[PDB]
């Protein structure tokens, strides 16, 4: 049986009409380190970028990703466990974070992907209507969000 | 226990009769039990207002059954003479419905009552 996934009802051509304030944002693992590297607090940094409340989210894979790093990145793990950071459960065997984040956005067009990875950034870019956040220079930047 | 159930209190009836009057002016109001029967069939109703003093009462007890089947909030108001006056018609009204229109100027007020009516149930 052939399967052609439906176009999400939340997308008006290349415009995602479903994402609105307050935002739900998936944190990729590398995001935390660069945020620490640039002395940018997570929760306020997102607020300054989007001028609206952001509800950061961390999946099991990203959480598992951080623990495996070791003592050097203890601070990143502590920030990731900030109670304002909600958690997402995963139902796939692999711990590979990049694939997990790509899948979730494909299923629900409600998440901003917060990452710096060139490979992941390109993959999310192909998926329509996925705002893509990153930390560069002095503060966070969001590329595909019309409301800004 | 009583066949008319739930029965809105005075505060709730006042707010309901406020909305129905506004819906009348904006042509979002269907009046009469037969109309309320039809709108449920087409699935274009937000909630059904009914008169608990209707003479006899049962004659509108088919509307609750259709509503509960279709998951439409419904409520009873004490007075039919009051309900008819709010609707703007010169005769008593036993049943009324609010037509569905997300592009109506009174959407917020309708949903406000639609919240409270649900709590009453």
């Amino acid at each position: 049986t052939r399967n052609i996934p439906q176009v999400s009802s939340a997308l008006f051509f290349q415009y995602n009409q479903a994402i609105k304030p307050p935002y739900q944002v998936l944190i990729d693992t590398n995001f935390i380190n660069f945020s620490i590297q640039k002395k940018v607090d997570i929760v306020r940094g997102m607020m300054d970028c989007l001028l609206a409340k952001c509800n950061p989210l961390i999946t099991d894979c990203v959480m598992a990703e951080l623990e495996k790093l070791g003592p050097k990145y203890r601070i990143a793990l502590k920030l990731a466990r900030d109670p304002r950071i909600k958690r997402l459960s995963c139902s796939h065997k692999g711990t590979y974070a990049d694939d997990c984040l790509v899948h979730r956005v494909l299923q629900h067009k409600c998440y901003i992907v917060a990452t710096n990875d060139a490979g992941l950034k390109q993959r999310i870019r192909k998926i329509p209507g996925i705002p893509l956040m990153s930390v560069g220079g002095h503060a966070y930047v969001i590329e595909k969000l019309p409301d800004v | 226990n009583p066949k008319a159930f739930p029965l809105a209190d005075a505060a709730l009836t006042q707010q309901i009769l406020d909305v129905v009057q506004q819906a009348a002016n904006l042509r979002q109001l269907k009046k009469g039990a037969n109309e309320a029967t039809k709108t449920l069939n087409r699935g274009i109703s937000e909630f059904i207002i009914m008169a608990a003093d209707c003479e006899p009462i049962e004659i509108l007890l088919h509307l609750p059954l259709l509503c509960e089947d279709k998951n439409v909030p419904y409520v009873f108001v004490p007075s039919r003479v009051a309900l008819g006056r709010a609707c703007g018609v010169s005769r008593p009204v036993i049943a009324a419905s609010i037509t569905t229109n997300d592009a109506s100027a009174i959407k917020t007020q309708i949903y406000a009552v639609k919240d409270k009516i649900e709590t009453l149930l």
Binding site: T1, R2, N3, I4, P5, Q6, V7, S9, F12, F13, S91, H92, H103, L106, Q107 | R42, G43
Partner: protein, 49 residues
């Protein structure tokens, strides 16, 4: 400009009807069936991997 945008938007609505299904007020009148037909072997649901 207002006329030009009006035509552009309604044209876009027609195209959006092609790319995906859209709620169109639901059933009107007696249920006649599926005017455009049913495909037995095609699935549109998004799969969880």
């Amino acid at each position: 400009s207002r006329v030009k945008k009006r035509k552009k938007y309604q044209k876009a609505q027609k195209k959006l009807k092609s790319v995906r299904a859209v709620y169109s007020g639901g059933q009107s009148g007696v249920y006649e069936g599926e005017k455009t037909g049913i495909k037995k072997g095609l699935t549109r649901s998004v799969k969880f991997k």
